[PDB]
Write a protein that binds this ligand. Structure first.
Ligand code: 3OC
Ligand code: 3OC
Ligand code: 3OC
Ligand code: 3OC
Lengths: 158, 157
């Protein structure tokens, strides 16, 4: 049905999608301003870590400081194979994509890092309130020269 | 009210029920979960230590994997299930938790907990591809396997 309430939802979903698209195409020095797409109290970060706890970055200002670190450590990062998923909630989107670039973490040799990622984007008033990324930390270990633990799966059918 | 979109709403509703059934399947019912798939459907784990998926291809293989899984994860339950419809009536995502005993050959019995994203793509009202994404490090912990710690110097507070 074409009601003003359904129309508002569509508008919201369209606006929010544009921001997800912008986020995912943000490269290079533009990364230093990606925080501006967040609410003042917005949270972003990595939900799949070796420690098992997220690295959550809280607040628009913190996100901007994190961007300085990220550009140092991932100096040429690009996201590719981007698929955006709208949901039944006009303020919640998922993205499946890959990423590749140099990895330059102190205490390790410089490497080439590739991973598969899922991102969650939740919105409030047209700005991102919570962004979360999910990847396989094992692929990061490989990029850093870190031995990847191996699980034997005995009897796993063929 | 347009017949195309009526078809889509219907397919999406039907598909949502199958996703719910899958996510609520527990205990011996797990041995019949393969029935929710197309004959050539694929399921499995997309986040592995090896970097390659453990993909199980076909309804019969899927049914075999379930015997294995019931041995290895005898009491597994999904919880905190959130189902996400998408713009494709045939594609859904699920965010959830899962936990249970982990009973692998050659490792001490453990208690395994992880956070999961699942992808479900449909064809003809059955699952053509299921993929699950998790953090393998939590499965290492559960088996007593040492997990390296990545240092991130400079990482701001
Ligand atoms: O920018 C990111 C959040 C901090 C951890 C980083 C990582 O090690 O992948 C990614
Ligand atoms: O996980 C990540 C890979 C490297 C770039 C990071 C970022 O600053 O977004 C995210
Ligand atoms: O049922 C499953 C697919 C094969 C690997 C398993 C695991 O080791 O997590 C999960
Ligand atoms: O990753 C998994 C943990 C144990 C159950 C397996 C399943 O139910 O498919 C999946």
């Amino acid at each position: 049905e074409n009601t003003s309430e359904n129309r508002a939802q569509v508008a919201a979903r369209q606006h929010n999608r544009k921001i997800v698209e912008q986020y995912m195409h943000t490269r290079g020095e533009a990364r230093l301003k990606r925080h501006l797409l967040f609410t003042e109290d917005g949270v972003g970060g990595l939900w799949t870590t070796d420690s098992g706890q997220p690295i959550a970055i809280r607040g628009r200002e913190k996100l901007g400081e994190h961007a300085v670190w990220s550009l140092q450590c991932f100096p040429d990062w690009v996201w590719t194979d981007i698929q955006i998923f709208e949901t039944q909630d006009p303020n919640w989107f998922w993205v499946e994509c890959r990423g590749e670039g140099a990895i330059v973490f102190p205490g390790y040799p410089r490497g080439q890092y590739r991973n598969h990622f899922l991102h969650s984007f939740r919105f409030e008033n047209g700005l991102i309130k919570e962004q979360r990324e999910f990847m396989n930390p094992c692929e990061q270990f490989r990029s850093l020269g870190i031995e990847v633990p191996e699980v034997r799966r005995d009897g796993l059918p063929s």
